[PDB]
Scaffold this active site. Structure first.
Site, mmCIF file in Angstrom:
data_model
loop_
_atom_site.group_PDB
_atom_site.id
_atom_site.type_symbol
_atom_site.label_atom_id
_atom_site.label_comp_id
_atom_site.label_asym_id
_atom_site.label_seq_id
_atom_site.Cartn_x
_atom_site.Cartn_y
_atom_site.Cartn_z
ATOM 1 N N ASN A 128 7.744 9.058 8.984
ATOM 2 C CA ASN A 128 6.449 9.721 9.000
ATOM 3 C C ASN A 128 6.448 10.944 9.907
ATOM 4 O O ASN A 128 5.931 11.994 9.515
ATOM 5 C CB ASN A 128 5.363 8.738 9.430
ATOM 6 C CG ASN A 128 5.011 7.757 8.341
ATOM 7 O OD1 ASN A 128 4.856 6.562 8.590
ATOM 8 N ND2 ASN A 128 4.881 8.254 7.117
ATOM 9 N N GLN A 183 0.873 -1.208 0.000
ATOM 10 C CA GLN A 183 0.000 0.000 0.000
ATOM 11 C C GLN A 183 0.895 1.239 0.000
ATOM 12 O O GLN A 183 0.686 2.125 -0.848
ATOM 13 C CB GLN A 183 -0.930 0.114 1.209
ATOM 14 C CG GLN A 183 -1.489 1.514 1.431
ATOM 15 C CD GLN A 183 -2.977 1.529 1.696
ATOM 16 O OE1 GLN A 183 -3.574 0.515 2.074
ATOM 17 N NE2 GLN A 183 -3.592 2.686 1.500
ATOM 18 N N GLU A 206 25.586 8.724 -10.869
ATOM 19 C CA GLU A 206 26.366 9.748 -10.185
ATOM 20 C C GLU A 206 25.918 9.924 -8.741
ATOM 21 O O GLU A 206 26.767 10.151 -7.869
ATOM 22 C CB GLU A 206 26.315 11.082 -10.931
ATOM 23 C CG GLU A 206 26.981 11.050 -12.296
ATOM 24 C CD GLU A 206 27.082 12.419 -12.939
ATOM 25 O OE1 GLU A 206 26.595 13.396 -12.337
ATOM 26 O OE2 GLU A 206 27.653 12.522 -14.046
HETATM 27 N N1 LIG Z 1 1.433 8.709 1.388
HETATM 28 C C1 LIG Z 1 1.019 7.511 1.908
HETATM 29 N N2 LIG Z 1 1.786 6.669 2.737
HETATM 30 C C2 LIG Z 1 1.293 5.459 3.186
HETATM 31 C C3 LIG Z 1 0.011 5.087 2.796
HETATM 32 N N3 LIG Z 1 -0.307 3.895 3.332
HETATM 33 C C4 LIG Z 1 0.731 3.481 4.069
HETATM 34 N N4 LIG Z 1 1.721 4.422 4.013
HETATM 35 C C5 LIG Z 1 2.977 4.195 4.747
HETATM 36 O O1 LIG Z 1 3.122 2.796 4.945
HETATM 37 C C6 LIG Z 1 3.365 2.454 6.298
HETATM 38 C C7 LIG Z 1 2.814 1.078 6.673
HETATM 39 O O2 LIG Z 1 3.047 0.162 5.627
HETATM 40 P P1 LIG Z 1 2.621 -1.376 5.786
HETATM 41 O O3 LIG Z 1 2.877 -1.869 7.191
HETATM 42 O O4 LIG Z 1 3.406 -2.207 4.799
HETATM 43 O O5 LIG Z 1 1.050 -1.312 5.421
HETATM 44 P P2 LIG Z 1 0.315 -2.428 4.494
HETATM 45 O O6 LIG Z 1 1.145 -2.804 3.274
HETATM 46 O O7 LIG Z 1 -1.016 -1.873 4.054
HETATM 47 O O8 LIG Z 1 0.013 -3.708 5.464
HETATM 48 P P3 LIG Z 1 -1.382 -4.554 5.568
HETATM 49 O O9 LIG Z 1 -2.310 -4.187 6.722
HETATM 50 O O10 LIG Z 1 -0.979 -6.036 5.659
HETATM 51 O O11 LIG Z 1 -2.135 -4.330 4.265
HETATM 52 C C8 LIG Z 1 2.753 3.588 7.095
HETATM 53 O O12 LIG Z 1 3.485 3.851 8.267
HETATM 54 C C9 LIG Z 1 2.843 4.767 6.147
HETATM 55 O O13 LIG Z 1 3.950 5.579 6.454
HETATM 56 C C10 LIG Z 1 -0.735 5.899 1.970
HETATM 57 O O14 LIG Z 1 -1.856 5.534 1.650
HETATM 58 N N5 LIG Z 1 -0.235 7.096 1.521
#
Ligand SMILES: Nc1nc2c(ncn2[C@@H]2O[C@H](COP(=O)(O)OP(=O)(O)OP(=O)(O)O)[C@@H](O)[C@H]2O)c(=O)[nH]1
Ligand SMILES: Nc1nc2c(ncn2[C@@H]2O[C@H](COP(=O)(O)OP(=O)(O)OP(=O)(O)O)[C@@H](O)[C@H]2O)c(=O)[nH]1
Ligand SMILES: Nc1nc2c(ncn2[C@@H]2O[C@H](COP(=O)(O)OP(=O)(O)O)[C@@H](O)[C@H]2O)c(=O)[nH]1
Lengths: 434, 428, 51, 60, 42, 434
Positions: free
Chosen positions: A200, A11, A248
């Site tokens: 974040n 995501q 680079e």
């Molecule tokens: N800009 C932006 N950053 C995101 C978004 N979604 C997640 N992040 C970043 O992704 C981090 C978490 O990633 P994961 O733990 O891999 O989330 P996931 O892949 O949805 O995990 P699942 O619940 O198994 O689906 C968060 O702390 C955010 O910083 C988003 O929709 N937009």
């Protein structure tokens, strides 16, 4: 002739890419659908051309779970993308690194490598890959590392820049975050080639204090990341006084082969009703870069030494105003550099004012991203180490991983690897005495 | 009838050479399309030194335009004199040069050097009596250093009796546009010792110093910088191009100007340099030309001559001027400043007074000086290289591309053995 | 070739580009204010649904 | 919230003011069509030092 | 002669300055190769 | 170039800042918002021409109470300052030098110092950090303390004028006002430059007689204080026959390095219907400058001597009529001058005529700001000590200061050095007998 393949895993990656592509589209001029306005070679850096005026991007959106790809396939960008490049799984990786790496990876990885191969067949000179993900859940971490192994096998001579969201150092949003993060750190130390960290909470604070947005959202958090990625990989998209290449960046920022974790910052994050009051000149935008409250990672640079900083100026910028800014910043004793590197600055000039998305940021005439390889990231690494040690003291949340199939020894291997990373960071930390 | 082939390597070399071609095209009266529109027959009398004849008077520059990045010659061809070169001289290839001397000397640069050399050959046997070759490059960074030195070695081993003029942009102390400049420059200087005949070192710091202090310019850009390099670039080769008394070509300068075969590093200078506001307050003549020429603020390299002895010096004057002025003021500058001139080489000035001045001016002078102020320039980057090299940093790409640890020590020992003679001449 | 070296062309270009930046910022200010009106209409909607 | 990433249709007064491009048509139609190769038999004349086509009048 | 000649060269330099000023105002009049404007505008 | 930031701390300062700025603008040209109405390079010093030909102020209105600072970001000049500039706190420094150099302050102090940085990085010759702060309500005392100290360290030799407002003889609007003074002069005597102290009791008396105004309010007083601050910083923002920058004031007034406490007195403070009756001639204005019933601090010059006086005339001032005035004064016997100072006063003449903010001070084609290190400010210094003594006597209103930091010692420690100041005055006035 120079182009890079963008891969978005999980995501996080998908959404950074959401913003990433919206921005790229605007910059070039490509409309949503893909057809251009009633009418250049810049589209060759990220898109292709079908001989019908339908620029399609070199993007691979991989997620083990739908609805995040289905939002893309339903929304306004359903015709920009190839309808099959958006690869969709059928079972979420479940914040399980080793589910995304050991059990649900084999139903999708052949398709993902097939699409990487199909995209790379339509490539004249592949400058590299851009892997967008998190250090979080299974989709963002395990499938990412399992992807990196296969691209190391298949594309061993090819560059792979990486944009990763590091775990939030103080609060976070899940409980297996240090487990997954140290596992993907161990599996991407030896395969990733330059991995830019984004935290974040640093975006949180810079949005609260500089962007004058007391309600920032993920539609803003990596809307800033879209800007910063474009400002990195735009020098091969336009011309410049000092044009800089993707190789680079690596040959000027990763001094030892293992030290490939730079932290970034953006310049002018000014807030529409705020920029009627500043010069925004090169000296003060560089000072705003080196000011310790505008970074992408919550880590204080004062507890460490800079090793290599690359400045990427885009817009109407004078290289000898850059000369003046660097001569000013090298005399301040607060910003400490390593002594085995008497000059540690790269300058990159691009004649392109930044595109502005309808939203929070204002456009400015000059904008620089500063990419620093600091020794201060060992603080965040050791904080995540204490996090994992405190959770792993009594085998908490390990039964899921060993039940799905990861062995017990991989945790100890990841611990030894990242402790070796600690030792390397200290070893490049202390000065020369011989 | 004499003859010079122009080599351009790297982004900096390509841009400086493009400004050079623009300057001498406007000097000879050649328009961007290549046809001739001039006013004096002396321009056409010796045009085929830089400009090969073609069908009907579209004179083509005899320059090869070389880079590992296929992006800078596109800007060169889109520039204000783009449509004048032969497209077979444009040689490139999509690869990552990566400001890397190993990547410009032992990989894709060494892949492209053969196809570069074929064009250099064709332009070298399309000659009548070649004086030699003239490479424009930047020592700091790759391509211009790596492929530049590889090209210099190959051209020297092919034609070993021709004068090689390499205009190099040596890295500056105050800033550095790339981080591996000591790494590139110690190897390129090591290769430039025992190949070339006339190196011309240009610092960017001195370029901006003459842009701010002397020119009084507010926003001096890279175009004006390469224009100030192109001024002396054109002014050194004027007696092989135009008539006048006391003619001097490149080998006459070289024999008249390098005492021992290693000390062939030179500091260029162009000094009818006035601002637009200070032009009208001036009484332009040969004494004042000597004043700006031997003043240390019109120099083109960031090295102060007053911490060293002048080994030998030339002034290539241009214009309808009396010669008692230049002769007596060379005598007077030798007598006024005596401790900064070597005594074991007497009458150590050179005068060569061509007749045709540059456009917009009545008299001009190009300064060439083999000062012992190259000491600081070499020692400084020796210090930077040793600091970067003791801790084994920024070098794993070099060892991956195929370097050995012993070759860097050879290069640093050779550059220190180049800094030793300039120690010895400062104390006899 | 006269475009590329006069330096007052470049200064006057700084002037025109800064003026264009200022007017474009004004257009952005209007757009963000329109966003604020849209958010207020949203809040009134949710108020009447709540009632 | 993911609908924000394609919404607010681009106005004709949102873009950056100018666009300085890097157009590779020169490299595009040169690269595939060779880089020149000296694969010929030489035609260079009998070049001498300074007496090309001399005169030998000083003889019996 | 060498006088009248010198005066003539000085006058040529002043007239060239005047022509440069008229040329600079003309070219700053308002000056845009369509390529310099992304489709966004045209 | 010519430059001088203005760090208004505390209500009195902020409030006075409002007046000082209003005056600076109307005099220079900046319109309420800015954008010089125009149709030359004055602003430069006390302003900053940003982009779009703007005119931003060089100030940092700091105070730990929203109320005041808020009435600036919601009134006439809510456009001149860049939000960030005006920093505000959450809880007040309830009359307590403690809350200053100790609690509610350790926090905000960090930012104000950073903001001071940028406001001085966009400069090239800071000629003085003018700091306007009263000597009562905690903030004015404690906050200033922390500031003065920090600045003295970073910005060293840099001048540091401080138009502080001296405590009052009688009147007084704080029963703890006494304590703060004897704890605030333990920092303006060891980290300052030429702190011009002015008593509110005099402007009161003057407003009644000369200005005629029977019951003017605060604004009326702060406005007179503006004419004075203006006159001082007018030679560094306009022309003059005999100019005088801030450095000249410090190397001409202060005698030994601890008598940096001069007194000011404006010139023609006449009142419309009353100015049409006098000649406001150079002599006449200086004849009044040394009068005992117009000094801006109750302290009377008769019961004292003049270590070294400074006279800064403004407007039509023939430079051969001031020598006339200074002679027509040094001749008198009433005015007495320390033997150790032969040369009398230093003349300062500027052409720019005092401007008029449609309010009180009427139109006078000439004026002068008179400074002097009178040997009689001791009277006031002593009045203060008595209060501190009478109060510390029954360690009263002390439980507070000692509950919010400040070990009991401070009061004692400082009061000793305050009496040390007393001796210094009754020591530089001693008549050279050897
Ligand atoms: N800009 C932006 N950053 C995101 C978004 N979604 C997640 N992040 C970043 O992704 C981090 C978490 O990633 P994961 O733990 O891999 O989330 P996931 O892949 O949805 O995990 P699942 O619940 O198994 O689906 C968060 O702390 C955010 O910083 C988003 O929709 N937009
Ligand atoms: N010129 C002027 N002086 C004032 C004004 N208000 C107060 N003063 C002076 O300031 C002194 C006390 O006010 P401050 O020191 O500013 O009080 P404060 O800054 O609010 O400090 P706290 O009460 O702790 O918040 C008084 O003795 C007055 O002489 C004003 O409105 N104008
Ligand atoms: N005078 C001048 N110097 C230049 C120009 N372009 C680049 N340089 C200098 O060249 C140096 C580095 O160039 P380099 O890395 O060798 O380019 P490369 O050969 O493509 O790798 C920089 O420090 C610049 O100061 C130019 O147009 N004129």
């Amino acid at each position: 002739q120079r182009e890079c393949i963008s891969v978005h895993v999980g995501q996080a990656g998908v959404q950074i890419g959401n913003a990433c592509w919206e921005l790229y589209c605007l910059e070039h001029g490509i409309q949503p659908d893909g057809q251009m306005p009633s009418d250049d070679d810049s589209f060759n850096t990220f898109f292709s051309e079908t001989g019908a005026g339908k620029h399609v991007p070199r993007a691979v959106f991989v997620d083990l779970e739908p609805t995040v790809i289905d939002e893309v396939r339903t929304g306004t960008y359903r015709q920009l993308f190839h309808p099959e490049q958006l690869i969709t799984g059928k079972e979420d990786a479940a914040n399980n690194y080793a589910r995304g790496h050991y059990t649900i990876g084999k139903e999708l990885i052949d398709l993902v490598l097939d699409r990487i191969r199909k995209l790379a067949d339509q490539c004249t000179g592949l400058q590299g890959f851009l892997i967008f993900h998190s250090f979080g859940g299974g989709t963002g971490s395990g499938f990412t590392s399992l992807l990196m192994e296969r691209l190391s096998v298949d594309y061993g001579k090819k560059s792979k820049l990486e944009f990763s969201i590091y775990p939030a150092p103080q609060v976070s949003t899940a409980v297996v975050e240090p487990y997954n993060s140290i596992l993907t750190t161990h599996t991407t130390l030896e395969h990733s080639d330059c991995a830019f960290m984004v935290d974040n909470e640093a975006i949180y604070d810079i949005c609260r204090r500089n962007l004058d947005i007391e309600r920032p959202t993920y539609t803003n958090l990596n809307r800033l990341i879209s800007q910063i990625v474009s400002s990195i990989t735009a020098s091969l998209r336009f011309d410049g006084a000092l044009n800089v290449d993707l190789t680079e960046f690596q040959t000027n920022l990763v001094p030892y082969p293992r030290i490939h974790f730079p932290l970034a910052t953006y310049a002018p994050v000014i807030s529409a009703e705020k920029a009627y009051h500043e010069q925004l000149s090169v000296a003060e935008i560089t000072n705003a870069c080196f000011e310790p409250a505008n970074q992408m990672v919550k880590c204080d640079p004062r507890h460490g030494k800079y090793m290599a900083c690359c400045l990427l100026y885009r817009g109407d910028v004078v290289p000898k105003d850059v000369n003046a800014a660097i001569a000013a910043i090298k005399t301040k004793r607060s910003i400490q550099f390593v002594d085995w590197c008497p000059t540690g600055f790269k300058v990159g000039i691009n004649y392109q004012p930044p595109t502005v998305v309808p939203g929070d940021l204002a456009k400015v005439q000059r904008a620089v991203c500063m990419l620093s390889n600091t020794t201060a990231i060992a603080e965040a690494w050791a904080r995540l180490d204490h996090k994992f040690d405190l959770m792993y003291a009594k085998r908490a949340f390990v039964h899921w991983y060993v039940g799905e199939g990861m062995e017990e020894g991989e945790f100890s291997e990841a611990r030894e690897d990242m402790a070796a990373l600690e030792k390397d960071y200290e070893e490049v930390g202390m000065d020369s005495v011989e | 009838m004499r003859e010079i082939v122009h080599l351009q390597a790297g982004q900096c070399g390509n841009q400086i050479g493009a400004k050079f071609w623009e300057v001498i095209s406007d000097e000879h009266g050649i328009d961007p399309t290549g046809t001739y529109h001039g006013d004096s027959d002396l321009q056409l009398e010796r045009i085929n030194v830089y400009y090969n004849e073609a069908t009907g008077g579209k004179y083509v520059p005899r320059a090869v335009l070389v880079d590992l990045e296929p992006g800078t010659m596109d800007s060169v061809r889109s520039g204000p004199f783009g449509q004048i070169f032969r497209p077979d001289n444009f040689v490139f290839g999509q690869s990552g040069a990566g400001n890397n001397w190993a990547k410009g000397h032992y990989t894709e640069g060494a892949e492209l050097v053969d196809s570069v050399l074929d064009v250099v050959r064709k332009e070298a046997e399309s000659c009548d009596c070649l004086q030699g070759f003239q490479l424009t490059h930047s020592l700091g960074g790759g391509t211009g250093s790596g492929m530049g030195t590889l090209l210099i070695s190959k051209i020297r081993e092919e034609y070993p009796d021709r004068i090689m003029n390499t205009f190099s942009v040596v890295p500056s102390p105050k800033v550095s546009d790339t981080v591996v400049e000591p790494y590139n420059a110690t190897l390129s200087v090591h290769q430039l010792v025992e190949n070339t005949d006339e190196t011309y070192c240009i610092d960017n710091e001195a370029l901006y110093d003459i842009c701010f202090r002397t020119l009084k310019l507010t926003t001096p850009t890279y175009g004006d910088l390469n224009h100030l390099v192109s001024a002396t670039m054109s002014g050194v080769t004027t007696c092989l191009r135009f008539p006048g008394q006391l003619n001097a070509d490149l080998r006459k300068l070289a024999v008249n100007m390098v005492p021992f075969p290693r000390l062939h590093f030179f500091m260029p200078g162009f000094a009818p340099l006035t601002s637009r506001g200070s032009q009208q307050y001036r009484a332009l003549t040969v004494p004042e030309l000597t004043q700006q020429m031997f003043d240390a603020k019109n120099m083109m390299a960031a090295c102060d001559p007053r911490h060293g002895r002048y080994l030998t010096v030339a002034a290539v004057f241009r214009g309808r001027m009396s010669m008692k002025e230049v002769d007596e003021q060379m005598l007077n500058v030798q007598n006024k400043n005596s401790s900064y001139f070597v005594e074991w080489i007497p009458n150590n000035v050179k005068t060569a007074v061509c007749d045709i001045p540059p456009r917009g001016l009545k008299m001009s002078a190009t300064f060439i000086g083999n000062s012992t102020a190259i000491q600081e320039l070499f020692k400084r980057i020796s210090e930077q290289f040793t600091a970067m090299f003791r801790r084994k940093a920024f070098l794993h790409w070099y060892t991956g591309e195929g370097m050995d640890e012993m070759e860097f020590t050879e290069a640093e020992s050779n550059m220190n053995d180049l800094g030793n003679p300039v120690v010895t001449r400062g104390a006899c | 070739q006269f475009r590329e070296c006069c330096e007052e062309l470049r200064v006057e270009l700084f002037c025109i580009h800064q003026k264009a930046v200022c007017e474009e910022r004004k257009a952005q200010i209007a757009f963000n204010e329109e966003l604020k009106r849209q958010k207020l209409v949203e809040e009134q909607m949710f108020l009447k649904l709540w009632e | 919230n993911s609908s924000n990433y394609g919404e607010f249709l681009p106005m004709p007064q949102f873009f950056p003011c100018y666009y300085t491009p890097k157009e590779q048509v020169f490299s595009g139609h040169i690269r595939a069509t060779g880089f020149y190769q000296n694969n010929t038999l030489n035609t260079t004349p009998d070049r001498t030092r300074t007496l090309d086509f001399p005169n030998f009048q000083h003889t019996l | 002669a060498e006088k009248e000649e010198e005066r003539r060269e000085f006058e040529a330099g002043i007239a060239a300055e005047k022509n440069f000023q008229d040329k600079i105002e003309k070219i700053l009049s308002t000056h845009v190769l369509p390529r310099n404007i992304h489709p966004m505008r045209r």
